[PDB]
Symmetry: C3
Subunit: 542 residues, 3 copies
């Protein structure tokens, strides 16, 4: 009939496993409930939220979600939230019992664990409404409407759902959330009254979790991976994690330190977070001053600026670099001018110069008589992600022989303070790999060494993530159903620590990014045993 004759003839003693039917096992009798709790706020006057979970009927819990009520932002100036605002709010999270800390994570590490989860990232705050830079005109004008963001606190209790869930029978569980200053989660200009905003802003958190009421629970001991972070000394290529006895993994990455700067940047693309989006935003900001259509030489620029009239030929020569500038519908009384030194950096008076005007090759557009502006059609340039990641301070630094920032006062007023706590590398997109070589030593012996980021490639492949780190995985054994595979220590032979040594690729000293400080971050996942005898407790595997 419907089945082909060749198949029916091929089919129509050996022990065979049933693949078409299964005995439906009766599970443990339980009832789940989505429980939300309001916390206790406390105040370096850091904001701390405490959530106490104690209920006879709450037998187990998993899937922690922290909601945050972002207030209405009213006033004058430019304002916007950092992408994934909710995760950036978190400085530290700790789940503890009467016997102490059961599990804890640093804000950045929780974000790193959720970077592959698109849904969790969108929930935490990723919209044009939240992340684009909105402007307030009147002192009562609404810049940002109030919104609620949801931060998924990924814990090891979620790995195998009910099986991995944190059991809390006859024990009090306290979820403590430490918040980063509101400065970190906000991108604003000088016009914005941050002083008042910081005073008026208050974190409004509410912890939600999936609670389980289990009838006659059969609690058995489990294993947990607890992350440990070590941040090296400023620009130092070495960091050491002490007392390493049973580690499942070791992650190594770099972070920029903007202490020597005012955290002000020329441009920000807002919601659009692609590398091209960052570059286009920068080009757009520079173009206002780069090509000027004026009646006689342009005014409102520093004496230091070298604004040159574009010849009939269209080509302007800034040293070896040629810039083709051709604007249409230019009035008979006006000429086309090019700012030949918009941003320039040099450590010596007659040496190499890093000039941003030289990074442009062709600028075409049409002058609008109605709006008295220049509408740019096509731009041919060599601007990179690093250029957009240079803090304004480094252009006007003492290392610079030249003035540095030759932009108009109008353009300089549009600069934005960016204090994102989770920036990696030396650029906003973490594009540039500054680690030339990695060395990992377990005790005094070399555990691993690499010249290329092959550990990052394996991390990206194995975790199915596009934003991985140089990670050394020691556990390839299935989680929850097995005791994780760990590096075994030998205290007697001094093999009880992990020492990381990197070799940073050095930059040109005449390039402003050379002066961006670096920090080596080393993350270690230590193995602990969860014991439930007389309350919940953890014990370090040694």
């Amino acid at each position: 009939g419907a089945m082909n004759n060749t198949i029916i003839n091929s089919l129509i003693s050996i022990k065979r496993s049933n693949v078409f039917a299964v005995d439906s096992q009766i599970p443990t009798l339980y009832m789940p409930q989505y429980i939300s709790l309001s916390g206790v706020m406390t105040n370096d006057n850091q904001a701390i939220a405490s959530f106490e979970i104690r209920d006879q009927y709450i037998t187990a819990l998993n899937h922690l979600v922290l909601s945050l009520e972002l207030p209405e932002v009213k006033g004058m100036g430019r304002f916007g939230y950092v992408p994934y605002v909710g995760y950036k709010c978190i400085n530290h999270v700790s789940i503890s019992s009467c016997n102490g800390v059961i599990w804890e994570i640093e804000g950045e590490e929780l974000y790193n664990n959720c970077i592959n989860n698109t849904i969790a990232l969108k929930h935490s705050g990723y919209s044009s409404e939240l992340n684009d830079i909105s402007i307030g005109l009147t002192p009562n004008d609404t810049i940002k409407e109030p919104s609620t963001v949801y931060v998924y606190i990924k814990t090891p209790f979620d790995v195998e759902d009910t099986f991995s869930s944190l059991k809390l029978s006859d024990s009090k569980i306290t979820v403590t959330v430490t918040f980063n200053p509101v400065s970190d989660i906000v991108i604003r200009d000088s016009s914005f009254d941050f002083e008042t905003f910081n005073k008026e802003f208050v974190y409004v958190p509410e912890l939600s979790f999936i609670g389980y009421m289990v009838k006659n629970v059969q609690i058995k001991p489990s294993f947990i991976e607890k992350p440990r972070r070590v941040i090296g000394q400023i620009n130092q290529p070495t960091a050491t994690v002490t007392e390493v006895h049973a580690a499942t993994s070791l992650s190594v990455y770099t972070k920029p330190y903007y202490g020597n700067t005012d955290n002000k940047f020329i441009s920000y693309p807002g919601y659009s977070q692609d590398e091209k989006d960052y570059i286009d935003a920068y080009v757009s900001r520079l173009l206002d001053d780069l090509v000027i259509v004026s009646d006689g030489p342009p005014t409102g620029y520093p004496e230091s600026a070298e604004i040159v009239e574009v010849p009939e030929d269209g080509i302007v020569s800034i040293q070896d670099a040629d810039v083709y500038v051709k604007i249409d519908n230019v009035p008979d009384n006006m000429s086309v001018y090019l700012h030949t030194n918009l941003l320039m950096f040099g450590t010596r008076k007659n040496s190499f110069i890093y000039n941003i005007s030289k990074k442009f090759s062709a600028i075409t557009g049409t002058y609008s008589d109605a709006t008295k502006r220049t509408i740019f059609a096509h731009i041919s340039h060599s601007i990179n992600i690093i250029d957009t990641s240079i803090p304004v301070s480094l252009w006007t630094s003492q290392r610079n022989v030249y003035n540095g920032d030759n932009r108009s006062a109008e353009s300089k007023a549009k600069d934005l303070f960016i204090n994102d706590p989770f920036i990696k590398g030396i650029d906003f997109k973490n594009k540039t790999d500054i680690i030339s070589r990695l060395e990992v030593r377990f005790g005094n012996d070399v555990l691993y060494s690499e010249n290329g980021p092959i550990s990052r490639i394996y991390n990206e492949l194995l975790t199915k993530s596009n934003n991985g780190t140089r990670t050394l995985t020691f556990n390839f054994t299935p989680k929850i159903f097995f005791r994780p595979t760990t590096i075994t220590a030998n205290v007697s032979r001094g093999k009880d620590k992990l020492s990381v040594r990197v070799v940073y690729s050095t930059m040109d000293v005449n390039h402003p990014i050379y002066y961006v400080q670096k920090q080596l971050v080393v993350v270690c996942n230590d193995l602990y045993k969860v014991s439930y005898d007389q309350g919940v407790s953890i014990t370090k595997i040694m």
Copy 2:
């Protein structure tokens, strides 16, 4: 050698260890799969397709895929299919045996179950060829070329492939598919001859499934989740699901009711389905009438229209709202005009007014002498997804004291009839969350209550979906291999019904969306036991 000495020494016995590097290859049940396609029996007012599966060699089946041959669309006017046309075709699907209905789903619920599946959605019809609004010029001009769409009928028999598959214990399985009217799956204008199209259109279905010929099948009873929806009365914040005895989940969402309207809308973005795409399409449609370049006052607009000449400063004042309009290359004989009341709403003669022209702040462009039209460069506006989702009827409703629709006859002729059966909320993107509070009661007692959509956040996280609903999950136990965890009823205490009560957000009476009728939809997944003794049969768990 290749392995580091520190590792070699660390390893080079007493404890019992599970083999993680090898496994005993289990011999499976002897079977042979086959992709079987069947032509059905068409019945009619609603189109019904019946597919009879009766074969001794077809032991089990799963993965139902319904194919649909869409005809060539010839004639005059604007025409396009709704996105994911194939799913929108479906009104109801039912898999039944001689012992009755085994499993059934409402068209919208099948779509909601597949909303996270990008592949299944693309297969059902998501292309510029199908969804963009094409125009026919001559009565024989081809608007749409014939195409075939594939609708994946996701059933509980697919969860664990061969293990979950529907077994055919020498029984006749009848797959019944009820189709929605062709009006629902089509977006057209007044120019399109729908009358003839509706008469000429016929659903051409073909049911495909993966059939399995199993040698010596060992059938065991299984469990199934059957969905049951309840739609509450027009503009009512309550709905009750009766005879709830064993439920695995409960979903709650809103649907708009467009009965009081002609289902006509000003704009549609076509294939491009982003929120910005919907907004841009609307702005584009309004701009034709909003800014006019004419020799003297513009003509072809109602007497009710207040078209004002743009002054030398460029700013036009519509009450408190200021509109900056500056067009380049305007001929000496012509002037720039702004329609100050393109679309307006009001309930009283001298109260608040919702004017779409006020929603604009800046309009810049250049007049093209060659095409005699205005090419808009940049638009600064406050137009939202709700504005685009307002049916034209509401602008010209009796409630409105003003005329309402002050557009040109040209613009009004371009309006499109949208009858998508799966619209949620009050806008085309289901952006606006109109549920301010949710209350779910099991009898007299409150089972669950929320002020924020935390149940929607959990649904989105747990299902890895970007388009979730406020869902209460009671079953966190692995499917197929276990009896699902259900909310247990108490008939004696009157706890055998689920009552849902919402608190809708209060809107302004001078805003046309206030008059968009709402309907509360509550979906319940009831647990049933699949019995194979003397044919396939289902029994409600009570």
Copy 3:
């Protein structure tokens, strides 16, 4: 009542092991095809999985247009073979490895998918840098990765040799005539390094496993049949089409670069044609063949090319100049009294503004009917013997901008594999019809079951969980002649006056044969029969 514990689990003690990421430099050998050999012999390397081949791409200096094919790393691979002293354990053809990784976005990005690598860069001076040196990572997906440590290739004190055969550099490069490929081909050398996750296992308990080995068969040019012989235990059978560009110079009018969407391919083509399609000139335009029919646009704006009307309106046109439309830019016809495929007719509206400063036409909006097929027509077919007309009426400037595309993994008849050219599929086991279809329902099931947007007409026989079970296979009957799989397709009929009708097709049939992995006295595989 007896209940299964769903809230707790006995944490099983695993096999004592220690993993290590091991990288190895190979031995290069030279139809003078480049071959890299990697010898893995270590007493302490007990097992291995997750093979990643790194490639150091050199600095490209010189003149002309140059760019790498998307996912350059995968396209470099012609064949990969993992073998022991007992012979080949597992092997795959370059295209099949790519097809197995097409659903993996991460692996694809690693192999080379960037604006830096895939956009078409231009070199102006003989020392100008076209492309900066870069390193690409190719994930060699093997059956040893399916269940991580459980599926891993065990090395029972045996020598494992990973052999990688490389495709010519011509395949992975998109270049113009201006680019000195002759010198580039001589100077280019593949620089590979094989990485894998090695495992040192204390007291390993090796048990025999099962492996699926892919076998492809390519049919003769324009033959709708292909047969896979000695089929005894197959888990799946994939059927697809590949274009053959032997009868062409592999030159194409346009390429979109990094932007790989269907619209991106179309927009790139429209952009290339627009330079010649609408001309603003002082008197009739020059520099075009005599065959070209460039017509002046009337005051009305509408130009009539037969039944097709083209609205052309350019702003700020000088008083001494007029707007001209090329009414036959690219045309094809088999007879002088037949239907004509004219690319100029595929346009309905062209609007723009003439820039006096740059002496150029800046196009604002284009209304056209150009498709993915149009963008996939090799230039050779426009100037084909079958065409009674000239064919390519473009300027010499436009013709010089054409790019040589030799991507080895092109499927169907278009660059996006959009057009389905199989009207009917017939699969025969022996001489009896095993499966037959009129629609690509096997492709729909493949796309659904594998969660891939780029599937093939695949017949899956194994729906049993991998590694933990012996795979379900189509059982053969040699006595009844049922020991071969014969595929017969019916190609979808195309119009003879459309240039794409002349694209030579090749039927590709892939069979996954079941083998048993034996570890007694070294690693060995045995074909299940």
